[PDB]
Structure formats: structure tokens, C-alpha cells
Symmetry: D3
């Protein structure tokens, strides 16, 4: 039920402006399906990656809160994405967190109530610090945030768009490797995460904050 009217620091949009995820998305793969067989195999594979350097990154990524995703792009972006160094940018990206994380995922989350892999398996994640929810797996709100942030970051810095998009992609993949999400939750999440950035471009406040981040970035360039 929250939105910009209750939490204007974390949403630009209203409840009425949300992507209807329940309407747009396909249902998650069901148990008994081949597509779920594949979700399982992707789980086991990520599981085997846990011991690697990519595994290490995934555990780190899995430690990210919604709030740390913005700064999680710094390396892809080419420069620190921080309150200190890029305040107009940090503010932009923070203020859209729950537009992407909540508004864009909610109706499908709440309807399907899907069990996460670690919970399905009665194990823990690769990670494993908050009191982990077992549920509302589909789609991934974290992946929706990471994808939506990559799309707006790619627009601010098209010179590094590919690195940015790949980071965005990988944030979601980290959740699959660490056992937080099925591959399909993360895939579904990139669809709604894209849709919400269309809506954000209709929003005056977003528009203005984006201009500011662009201007900031520009001066940044010398």
C-alpha cells in the first residue's frame, strides 16, 4: 500500500501509476513443469558457482540492501555513485527504489506468493543477515531495482552503457547464484523493471531530478 504519497523519499509514483505486474507477467513456472525443472537446475548450477570468484561477488551482492544498489554500480559507471561524490545522482536513484521494488512487483508478488529456492530446499542461502522471507519470490524486487537502475544509469552515461547494463544484469544473477531467487523470478523482474522506467519518464519530479543528475555528471566530466 505504500507509494510516493506515504514515502516520497523512496517513490516518485503513486499506487495508480504502478505497473500491473499480475496482469503483464506470465505465471511463474509451476512444480510439475519443465520450466520449473530448469529453475531447479539453474539453482544447482549457481550453487556450484558459490565457491568461485563469481560466487564471492554473488555473496557480496546478496548482502546489498535496496539502498546499496545505486552504489553497487560505481565500477560499471566509471565513477563513485555516492552521496558525497554524486549527490544529484544518488538522490535520483534512491527516490525510485520502491517504484521498481514494490509498485512494479506487488500484485504478482502478493498473488503468487512464491517460495524462494533456499526455503523450497530447506537450506540457507550462500549468504545467509536479515530474517529471510520464504515467499513473494516472483518477481524479484531486488532484480527489478537493479535493472531499472541500470536503464536509468545507461541513459546518464551511454559511453558506459554496456558495462552498466551488464552490472544491472548481474545483480539479478547474484540472487540466483546465492539461492535467493529462481532464474524465472529474476527474468520476470527485468520485464517489470523496464516497464517502470517508462512510467518514471512521465513523472515531473523524476524528470527534473534526472536533469540534475545529468548536469552533475556533465560537470563531473571536467
Amino acid at each position: 500500500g505504500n507509494d510516493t504519497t506515504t514515502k516520497p523519499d523512496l517513490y516518485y509514483l503513486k499506487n495508480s501509476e504502478a505497473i500491473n505486474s499480475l496482469a503483464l507477467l506470465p505465471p511463474p513456472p509451476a512444480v510439475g513443469s519443465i520450466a520449473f525443472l530448469n529453475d531447479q537446475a539453474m539453482y544447482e548450477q549457481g550453487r556450484l558457482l558459490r565457491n568461485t570468484e563469481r560466487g564471492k561477488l554473488a555473496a557480496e551482492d546478496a548482502n546489498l540492501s535496496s539502498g546499496g544498489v545505486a552504489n553497487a554500480f560505481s565500477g560499471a559507471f566509471g565513477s563513485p555513485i555516492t552521496e558525497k561524490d554524486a549527490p544529484a545522482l544518488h538522490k535520483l536513484l534512491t527516490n525510485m527504489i520502491e517504484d521498481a521494488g514494490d509498485l512494479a512487483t506487488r500484485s504478482a508478488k502478493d498473488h503468487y506468493m512464491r517460495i524462494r529456492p533456499f526455503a523450497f530446499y530447506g537450506v540457507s542461502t550462500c549468504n545467509t543477515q536479515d530474517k529471510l522471507s520464504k515467499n513473494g519470490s516472483y518477481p524479484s524486487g531486488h532484480t527489478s531495482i537493479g535493472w531499472a537502475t541500470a536503464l536509468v544509469l545507461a541513459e546518464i552515461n551511454p559511453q558506459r552503457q554496456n558495462e552498466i547494463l551488464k552490472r544491472g544484469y548481474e545483480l539479478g544473477q547474484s540472487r540466483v547464484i546465492c539461492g535467493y531467487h529462481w532464474q524465472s523470478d529474476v527474468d520476470a523482474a527485468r520485464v517489470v523493471g523496464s516497464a517502470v522506467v517508462a512510467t518514471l519518464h512521465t513523472n515531473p519530479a523524476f524528470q527534473q531530478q534526472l536533469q540534475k543528475a545529468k548536469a552533475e555528471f556533465a560537470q563531473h566530466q571536467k
Copy 2:
């Protein structure tokens, strides 16, 4: 090799501005994988839908050329998307066709050279009028166009964003039902189709044409 410098009526962007699809996307499911088993089952299911009213629409959609996608949104959009009735809009959407269809899909297309389902199966499509290519299935350039158009349309008309996005989604699904594309080609295509609309928002000409389509739409509203 084409781009805006060779075909400025069908691209806003340059070769250098393209999404590196080969870099961003996962490889397509391989034969021997469970994920390919699923692509197959999705093929057979779409195949069984061919006889239905959804099957009818998919055959119609499958008749669309890149150029007919814009107008294919008219019902979702709420009003005719035509040269006659919405010229600023039609122009916008046409001019980005190959940004989405080509630039955003090319490196992965050309690298993987994937076989389409009808060709894999040695059958025809649900459709079946051009001399069908057997290949460069992954990702789908048609689905990339349809998704990217839905994202920019959703921005022009957020009141109908959900209907618009669902139409966009379904254009790609039509290609799976009709046998033109594997489900994974269409899924991959929505990722690059989103990425290219980020890039388009960095482009002055696009920006200006989008303002015009917005203004046109506005007067349209009475």
C-alpha cells in the same frame, strides 16, 4: 552494418551506440539442455494454440512487418497509430525500428546464428509470405521492436500503459505461438529492447521527435 548514417529513416542511432547484445545476453539454450527442452514444450504448446482465437491473432501478428508494429498498437493505445491520424507518433516509432530490430540484436544474432523452430522441425509456421530465414533466431528482432515500442508508447500514454505493455508482450508471444521463434529468443529480445530505449533517450533527434509525439497526443486529447 547499417545505422542512422546509412538509413536515417529507420535508425536514430549509430553503430557505436548499439547495445552489445553478444556481451549482455546469456547464450541461447543449447540442444541437450533442459532449458531447450522447455523451448520445445513452449513450441508445442503454441502449436496447439494455433487453432484458437489467440492462434488467429498470432497468425495475424506473424504477418506484421517491422513497419506494421507501430499500428499494431492502436487498440492498446486507445487511438489510431497511423500516418494519417498520428503522424508525429508514427514517425517517432518508425525511425527507431532498426535501432531495436537490428542494432540491439546484431552481435548475438550473428554470433549464435540460431535455428528457428519451424526450421528445426522442418515444418512451416502457423502463417507461413516472405522467404523465411531459418536462422539468427536469438534474439528476436521483431520482439525487440515490439517491446521497445511498447516502452516508448507507455511513456506517451501512461493512462493506457498496462494495455500497451501487454500488447508489446503479446507481439513477441505471437512469434512463439506461430513457430517463428523459441520462447528464449523472445525473452532475450525484451532485455535488449529495453536497453535500446535507454540509449534512445540520450539522442537529440529522438528527444525532439518524442516531444512532438507527446504534443500531438496532447492535442489529440481535445
Copy 3:
């Protein structure tokens, strides 16, 4: 819509007395499911059996009309099940054909409208003489008849109950081997085929005809 009131030679029961197959049965396996993967493998296996002596029997069985099932038990039963030799018996078994074949399968048939294997595969059966329906596969009305007949036959001749039940079982298996039905259609059919024989035992006319078949069988025994 037919029943005993329209076709009293082929039903004992009324429409109101039918097994609600749509209510009782699980849905058929869907395309995309592992259970459908198994239906497919059972298809291919039966297909390979077509060349054998069991294949020969299945083609013969597949030539049976509903009316020929009764006599199709003669060998299992131990003696000819014919108008000539066992008229009280033949009459009993004929008069319940559509109770089992129709009434007991109808609501699920008509609701699911499932595609038969030969039609799914765009091939023919092992058989292949009537104008084959592509559809209403689930459940199998022929298997429902064969199972229900085996149950009532087993009651008349418990000395040969095992041979009788195995024949009953195999009639349905013949339809899987020949490509007429998915294994799941035949399995579903044995459930409703059993349910309808419970109902038949509540029916005065059935009861009386069954007494006659028992008496006939008795004199048959010397």
C-alpha cells in the same frame, strides 16, 4: 445429451445419474509438464511395439467399436460372449456401453477437448476405418467401456477374474500403443469406468439383467 431416455438400448442411466467426470478427475497433463513428457514417451514406446505380436493385437483392438468390446472378452471370460451363445450376458454389456462411454466421460471430454496423440503428431494411428476425431481424448470412452465391462464380467465369472481384469486393462493399453490415446487418458478412464459400475448396481434394470446373465452363466457351467 443422450441417455437411457433417448437410447434405452445403450444406456441404463440418466443424465442426472452420470459420474461428474469433470469434477472427479484431475486435469489432463498439460504441454509444458513433465507428466506430458511422460505421455509422449509412452506414445513412442507403444509406437515401437506396433511391429510386434502385441502390436498386432493392439491394431485389432483398435478396430473394435464400442459394440465389439463385450465379445472382445471371450477368451479372458473362458467362453463366447455372443448374441448366439450368451444372449443375457451380451444384452447386459451392450445396454451399459454409453453409461460408461458417454455419461461417465462427457463433462471432462467436452471441457478439456484434448488432442489425441496421432493428431498432436500429425500422423496416423497404428490402425488407421472411421473418420478419426482429433479431440475429446481425455478421458478415453473406449477404455471406460473396457474397464467397466471387465468389472462386471469379473463379478459374473470370479473364477476368471484375473484374466478378465487383465483383458480389460489391455483394451485401454491397445489404444495407447496404437496412438489413439495418451496413457493419461486411459488411466483417467479407468477411474470413471469404475465409478459408473457403482451407479449401475443401483439401477433396477441393470440388477435384473445382471441376475439373468448370472443365471445364464450358471447353466452354462453344466
Copy 4:
């Protein structure tokens, strides 16, 4: 080795009168088969249902002993099935418990010695009060009892036949959801459970007890 001659309170039939389950039934799905893959997925799905209201019922059903199945139909039947209220009926249903549970399942049970799901998985059931056997899974004697009871109940009260059959069906499904049995054990069990009610109708004592239950039910009706 028991039968009516050793335990005439729990069998109507003799050893010689049993359904030869080993002869009639297909072998259970083997490990390495797709049909076993499906048994597994049905296990995991039931497992996810454990938390629901259907899960609650399944745990309750899983607490049933053979003796409590009769009364487990009371709601489907429309009235209490109890020694107190429906003694002729309760007696009928009790006296056939092991005809269905044992005689009808024995040869296949003992031959295949199949491992139950909880034991396969080295876990417990949804339930989990007796010292659980790991083995003789195929077919399910509990499901055979529940199905056979539904068939004879459906005959006593055809007005509620559909509710009765659905309850019967669900008793077996409870065992799949709770982890006691593979879906295939329960499916196999409905086949032999039907066969044994054919045999029961040949048995004088059963016939007479069934008449009594019918008469009792009749007076019950006012």
C-alpha cells in the same frame, strides 16, 4: 497370509479370491524413468501444499488408520458413518478393509518392495505416529481401501455419489501430499481397489451385509 478364514472381521474374502495385483498392475516407475521424474515433482508439489488448508486436511487424513476411513466419509456421505449411528454400514465397511488393503495389494507390494517418498528423501512426512514403514509403497493399501469404500458408499447413496467419489479420491491424494506415497502408488491403488469391489459383489456375506446397510440407510431417510 491372512484372510477371512483367519480374520473374518476384517476380510470377506479368501486368499484364493484375491486380485492378483502383481499380474494386473504395471511395474512402478523406475528410478531413471521420466515417470519417476513425475512422481518426484508430484511429491514436491504436495510438499508445498502442506502449509495450506488442503495441507491441513492431508495431515489429518494421514492420521487415519484403516479403521478410520469409513468415518472419514461422513461429510461426503451426508450423515455420520459411525457404530452409533450407522452400525450396519460401519460393519460392512470394516469387514472389507483388508480385502481392499491387503488381499488386493499384496503380491505387487511384496514383489516390488518399493521405497516410500519420505524414506527415499530421508525425511519425514507431513504428519509424521506409528513406526513408519519405508517400503511396500506400490500400490497403496490405504488408497485401495479409500477407493473401494467410495465405490461401495456411492452405491448406497447415489444421490451423493459425486461427493463420495471425490472424498475417496482425495484420501489417496492426502497420502501423496503428506509424503506417504508416490502419485503412482495411489493411482495403481485405485485400479486394484476397483477390482476387489467386483469380487465383493460375488460374496454372500458381503451381499447380505450390503442389503442391511441399504435398508439402514433407507430408514435413515425418514
Copy 5:
């Protein structure tokens, strides 16, 4: 039934000296198994390779008769394996053809009578010049020959053992790619093909012919 006593030009060994393939080998994957699912996917994959340069080689290899395998190693071996150039060698390798092709595969061939992929699929091979047998697929006699020849060639020229073994391996893989054999037939064939070279080393005539091929090769080396 043939052997060295009937065809001493094509066998060194007798019937009594054969590898009992039926005894040693596992059964082939059955339809309904996951291992057969994999045989199928390996079929489809080879099928897609048919258009490539590896596809070209496989079609060529598929044109080989048993008699042409020896010379088919010339490139791996480093020098022509021909009657003209390496007669002692050519003779050795020819004289063991049916030891490997027949004796080592026969009992399993004849027992299982397995259907080849092209026949299973009702299609042709990649090849497709003799009147193709549909059957005795398991194991592959051609692959048994190619593997057994690679093992004896590797012994004559250990400097090129790796190239030789890889050629040997690939001869069998060519049969999978071209649709002549399931992957499992070819795998099974390498087991019996190895076993028969153990037996060949017990055979005086083989021993002597092998000494001659070694001596010939030696002079070949300058």
C-alpha cells in the same frame, strides 16, 4: 555365426573367443527413460551439426564401409594406410574387422534388436547408399571397429597416439551426428571394442601380423 573358421580374411578369432557383449554391456536406454531423452537430444544436436564442416566429415565417414576404416586413419596416423603403401598394416587391420564388428557386438545386437535413430524418426540419415538396416543398433559394430582399430594403431604409432585415438573416437561420433546410431550405441561399442583388442593380443596370427606391421612401420620411419 561366422568367424575365422568361415572367413579367415576378416576374423582372427573364433566364435568361442568372442566377447560376450550381451553379458558385459548394460541394456540400452529404454524409451521412457531419461537416458533415452538424452540419446534423443544428442540426435537433434548432431542433426544441427550436419550443415557444418564437421557435418561434412560426418557424412563422409558415414559413407565408410568396414573396409574403409583402416584407411580412414591415414591422417591421424601420419601416413597412408593403404594396400599400396602399408600392406602389412592394412592386412592386420582388415583381418580383425569382424572380430570387432561382429563377434564383439553380436549377442547384444541380436538380443536387443534396437531401432536406429533415422528409423525411429522415420527419416533418413545425413548420408543417406546401402539398404539401411533399421535395427541391431546396440552396440554399433562400425564404432567397435573404429575404436579397436584406433587402439591397435596407437600401439604401432604411439608418437601419434592422441591423434589416432581422437580419430577413432570421432568415427563413432560421425555415426551419431549422421543419424545412424544413438550416442549410447557408440559408447557401448567402445567398451566391447576395447575388450576384443585384449583377446586379439592372445592370438598367434594377430601377434605375428602385428609384428609385421610394426616392422613395416619402422622401415617407414627411414
Copy 6:
């Protein structure tokens, strides 16, 4: 890095003489593949065999060190294969242990670093006395030893070649049943285990030791 020059008691061959396993072998089945699905099912099946008499043997076999494989053939061979009773033979077989176990498996082992089943599953083996490695599963060095020993044993005693080869086969199968190895590791291992016996026949010391074992066996025969 060891070989005959460092450990001449356990290798006949040098590093340069090794089978290039990385070059020859296919990659192991990947997670996400159907072939891995099959490796899993073979794991679960062996797992269910653990309780049987074959299970008992597999646990015993799993207790074998490389050094105990030679004597593990005594029953197949027909007579004790021991330092006491068959010293020339025991010496032969010992001296080739690491040719088969190490040299023939190394490059593929070290490259793929595959996880063993018990480790994949986070369980123990059927066995479970050394500090079990989790890794270098593909191919199995133990199976390579057992197969290579069966091939050289079959040559010494062709009268018992079939029993010998079947024992050889089963040694590897024991590792699958006990959870030490995937079926594919064991299959891959029989390929390289055959290749190394070709190389061994090029080695003077091996040749001479083999003559001695043959002579010993001969006198053994009376």
C-alpha cells in the same frame, strides 16, 4: 607431475607418454543438461541399491585402494592374485596403477575439477575411511585402473575373459552405486583406461613383465 621417472614402482610410462584425456574426452555433463539429469538419476538408483547384496559389494569395492584392485579380480580370474601366489602378475598390475589412474586421467581431471556426487549432495558415500576429495571426479582414476587391469588380465587369461571384463566393469559401477562418482565419470574412465593399455603394449618393461605373468600363469595351469 609424477611418472615412471619419479615413481617407477607405480608407473611404466612417462609424462610424455600419457593419454591426453583433456583432448580425447567429451566435457562432463553440465548442470542444466539432460545428461546431468541422467547422472543424477543413476546416483539415486545406486543409492537405492545400497541396501542390497550388490550394495554390500559396492561398499566393499569402495573400500579398495588402487593397490587392492589387482587382488579384487581374484574371483573373476579364477585364482589368487596376490604377492604370495602370483608375484609376477601382482607386480605387473601394480606397476601400471598410476599410468591408468593418474597419467591417463590427469589433464581432464585437473581441467574440469568436477564435484563428486556425495559432495554435490552434501552427504556422505555408502562407505564412507580417507579424507574424501570433493573434486577431480571426471574421469574416475579408480575406474580407469579397474578397466585397464581387466583388459590386461583378459589377455593373460582369455578363458575367463568375460568374467574378468565384467568384474572390471563392476568396479567402476561400485563407485556409482556408493556415491563416489557420476555414471559419466566412470564411462569416461573406461575410454582412457583402454587407451593407456595400448600405450603399455609399446613399453619394453611392461612387455617383459607381461611375458613373466603369462609364464607364471602357465605354470599355474599345472
